[PDB]
């Protein structure tokens, strides 16, 4: 048999060839047919036929036999190298997919190879194939993702690991720097674009809930100058389409915000070796302006860790801050006004809330664009140019005063150590806008706050209402009191006489009785509506009870973060790490990245005698030291290594305590005589403050 007149393969028609070739000693015709049909796209489209036209099981079972012999595997390795460059050029100019949807049958056959994970494919087979699958149209990609969403956890993990190791290998082997950018590489970009496919397969395959969305964000009205210019241009009747949304999120119709529990934890898609070679200043520009052949990794934010994503948001905020400096210069030149490039805030120490409220609410009406200037807070009666020192002090002061239980805005739970909105307080809508603005101004001006909220608060800020499953952190006792109701195996309408009307204690101590439906006490709880009572009790507790308090809080947060990519890069889980910081205090990293000036060197007598005192500080004394030098008790995103502390020499051995310049994280350390004297002054400096 010549076997030179075949153009496609099925399960039985390759099984018979294997059976007939087993009795001989050649095994060569199988290699020839594998290298002839699997190297041609037109052969693979019609191969293994039965929205897909290839049977997965037939492909799975044939591969379990062909990859038994070592030489047969090498045919598969070589077939991919010959096939992919054809498909890459075929999908770029020939416009093949629209002609026949069966072209996608090519990639499913390849992606089911068991040895794609093996290190032998990382050289030339996989990188070229990812180039072919990176050029698929949005229509093919959307339906390809849907088939992958039906896989279980192990299959998705294998598929993700295939493209992850290619990304690490192309970065480990090569050397990328500020002159050899990662973006222009044609292998990592194609592998990252291919990793996005399995990412959305993981999103869709998990628990997806779409209909539980909040109200649309109240878009702020631009200044009167921009409104007037719109009427002249005749485009005053149509609005902007909105935030930049991934084009793959539109074809599928499912966003990452909907996915509650994915098949795989979202932190597993982060490629740490990629992050350590990424220049986020150049990556942001490729995100804004479309450059020739540079691919911005901010278009695939799932691959960046918290530190790298925090840098991308930082550059977007700073560039918007610079644009407000150019406009103020233009106003003084052309219009002859006074140069005011700052969001200047004059507040008193005893009236932080009242002063910051009458100033920020005024700006939110007259000049809504002033909130995007650099913050410059100065306290009344005190003189000083604020480089960041006073902003850090003000951010700590307003947060520690807003969350005071006496103010009545937030309730404190001493068990879980989290704050929740207080629905009892009324006529305090204006303050809820202030705390929303302050959170937005903290992200914008890059200062971390000491704010303790349940994860539901950061989910409602992003637009997702709190469901029953989110009650485990907000109201821990009500969660188990309601979980037991569903878990009860016996009858529910007789053992306890709970009706559809609830009771809630208030500040006045009068338990008000609330009816979920029209009448609660007139309707008992039955097993048929056992799940219904939970779905309305949780909805009222998280959403309906605090609707007015959270509407103002969300409105203020949106006035400062509407044009930022915050909704694009950060999931609700990662918002908390951005507003607040990490509580872990790795003082070894602080020592590693500390710089010295004024005469001190890394191996000075006092500097070496200084790091032996802080390393012996207890947990409480490590917190006091950071509050003295940084202005915050917490560590920035990442760790203390990102906190480039500086120790500066301050004159001879004195009885004066050390002083700190918290704007630049500078500790001014006199050259004390001994180690014991250094400890006494250091302890006295951080405790009194």
């Amino acid at each position: 048999i010549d076997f030179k007149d075949v153009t496609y393969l099925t399960e039985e028609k390759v099984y018979e060839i294997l059976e007939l070739c087993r009795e001989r000693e050649d095994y060569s015709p199988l290699i020839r047919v594998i290298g002839r049909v699997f190297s041609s796209a037109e052969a693979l489209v019609q191969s293994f036929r039965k929205d897909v036209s290839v049977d997965i099981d037939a492909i799975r079972r044939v591969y379990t036999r062909l990859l038994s012999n070592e030489k047969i595997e090498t045919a598969f390795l070589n077939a991919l190298v010959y096939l992919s460059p054809n498909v890459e050029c075929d999908l770029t100019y020939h416009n093949v997919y629209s002609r026949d949807p069966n072209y996608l049958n090519l990639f499913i056959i390849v992606m089911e190879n068991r040895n794609l994970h093996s290190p032998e494919y990382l050289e030339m087979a996989l990188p070229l194939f990812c180039k072919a699958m990176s050029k698929l149209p949005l229509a093919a990609q959307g339906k390809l993702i849907r088939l992958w969403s039906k896989y279980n956890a192990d299959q998705i993990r294998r598929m993700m690991e295939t493209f992850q190791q290619l990304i690490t290998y192309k970065v480990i082997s090569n050397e990328f720097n500020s002159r050899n950018l990662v973006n222009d590489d044609d292998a990592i970009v194609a592998a990252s674009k291919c990793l996005k496919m399995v990412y959305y397969a993981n999103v869709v395959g998990g628990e997806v809930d779409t209909n539980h969305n909040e109200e649309d964000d109240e878009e702020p009205i631009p200044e009167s100058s921009e409104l007037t210019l719109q009427e002249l241009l005749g485009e005053e009747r149509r609005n902007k389409k909105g935030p930049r949304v991934d084009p793959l999120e539109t074809e599928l119709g499912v966003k990452t915000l909907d996915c509650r529990k994915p098949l795989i934890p979202f932190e597993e898609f982060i490629n740490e070796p990629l992050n350590e070679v990424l220049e986020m200043d150049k990556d942001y520009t490729f995100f804004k302006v479309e450059t020739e052949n540079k691919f911005s990794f901010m278009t695939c934010p799932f691959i960046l860790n918290a530190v790298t994503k925090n840098l991308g948001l930082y550059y977007d905020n700073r560039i918007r801050m610079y644009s407000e400096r150019r406009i103020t210069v233009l106003y003084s030149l052309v219009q002859g006004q006074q140069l005011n490039p700052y969001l200047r805030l004059k507040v008193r120490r005893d009236h932080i809330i009242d002063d910051a409220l009458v100033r920020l609410e005024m700006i939110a009406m007259e000049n809504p664009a002033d909130l995007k200037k650099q913050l410059y807070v100065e306290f009344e009666g005190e003189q000083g140019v604020d480089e960041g020192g006073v902003s850090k002090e003000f951010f700590q002061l307003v947060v520690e005063e807003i969350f005071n239980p006496d103010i009545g805005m937030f309730t404190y739970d001493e068990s879980t150590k989290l704050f929740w909105f207080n629905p009892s307080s009324f006529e305090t809508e204006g303050q809820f806008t202030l705390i929303g603005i302050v959170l937005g101004l903290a992200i914008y001006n890059n200062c971390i706050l000491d704010v303790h909220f349940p994860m539901v608060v950061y989910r409602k800020l992003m637009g997702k209402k709190g469901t029953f499953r989110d009650l485990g952190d907000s109201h821990p006792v009500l969660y188990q009191s309601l979980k037991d109701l569903l878990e009860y195996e016996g009858n529910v309408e007789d053992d306890m006489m709970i009706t559809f009307q609830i009771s809630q204690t208030d500040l006045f101590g009068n338990p008000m009785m609330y009816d979920l439906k029209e009448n609660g006490d007139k309707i008992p709880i039955t097993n048929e509506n056992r799940k219904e009572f939970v779905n309305l009790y949780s909805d009222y507790i998280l959403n309906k009870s605090v609707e007015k308090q959270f509407k103002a809080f969300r409105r203020g947060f949106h006035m400062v973060t509407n044009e930022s990519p915050l909704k694009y890069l950060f999931r609700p889980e990662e918002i908390e790490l951005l507003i607040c910081g990490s509580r872990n205090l790795d003082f070894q990293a602080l020592e590693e990245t500390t710089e010295y000036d004024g005469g001190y060197t890394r191996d000075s007598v006092l500097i070496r005698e200084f790091w032996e005192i802080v390393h012996s500080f207890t947990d409480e004394q490590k917190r006091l030291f950071l509050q003295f030098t940084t202005g915050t008790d917490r560590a920035p995103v990442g760790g203390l290594g990102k906190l480039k502390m500086i120790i500066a020499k301050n004159g001879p051995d004195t009885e004066r305590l050390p002083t700190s310049h918290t704007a630049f994280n500078v500790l001014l350390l006199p050259e004390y005589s001994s180690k014991e004297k250094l400890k006494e002054r250091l302890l006295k400096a951080i405790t009194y403050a």
């Binding site: 921009e226 007037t228 241009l233 389409k241 302006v289 644009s323 406009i327």
Partner: protein, 141 residues
């Protein structure tokens, strides 16, 4: 002059209501409230702008105010930039069918200017949803 569907929008349409011509019409600026020069009126007619009505009066824009506020909107409301081919793919239309104004003077781009943008690989800037280019007059050394 109150209902938008009744009051005129373009300058030639407005000139008939006051029984004047484009030659001896008197218009004020919507921003600085100063009379428009004759060349400013002709530029307003040439740049295809819309009459703005405030308290029942017809207002135009002079050159200084228009350029100033176009610059301010470019600085403050810049979203992103795209190439011509990417824009054509995104809108699935030829560049002639799109309304693209100059980033500095708000003059709609002639097909030759869009062709120059395509040939020089210059990017079109998205400013608060309005796609903008750069006309020949504003792009001269």
């Amino acid at each position: 002059f109150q209902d938008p569907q009744e009051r005129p929008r373009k300058l030639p349409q407005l000139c008939t209501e006051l029984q004047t011509t484009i030659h001896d019409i008197i218009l004020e600026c919507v921003y600085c409230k100063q009379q428009l020069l004759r060349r400013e009126v002709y530029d307003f007619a040439f740049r295809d702008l819309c009459i703005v009505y405030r308290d029942g009066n017809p207002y135009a824009v002079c050159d200084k105010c228009l350029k100033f506020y176009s610059k301010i909107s470019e600085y403050r409301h810049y979203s992103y930039s795209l190439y011509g081919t990417t824009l054509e793919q995104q809108y699935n239309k030829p560049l002639s069918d799109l309304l693209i104004r100059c980033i500095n003077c708000q003059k709609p781009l002639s097909p030759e200017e869009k062709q120059r943008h395509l040939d020089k690989k210059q990017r079109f800037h998205n400013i608060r949803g309005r796609w903008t280019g750069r006309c020949m007059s504003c792009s001269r050394s």
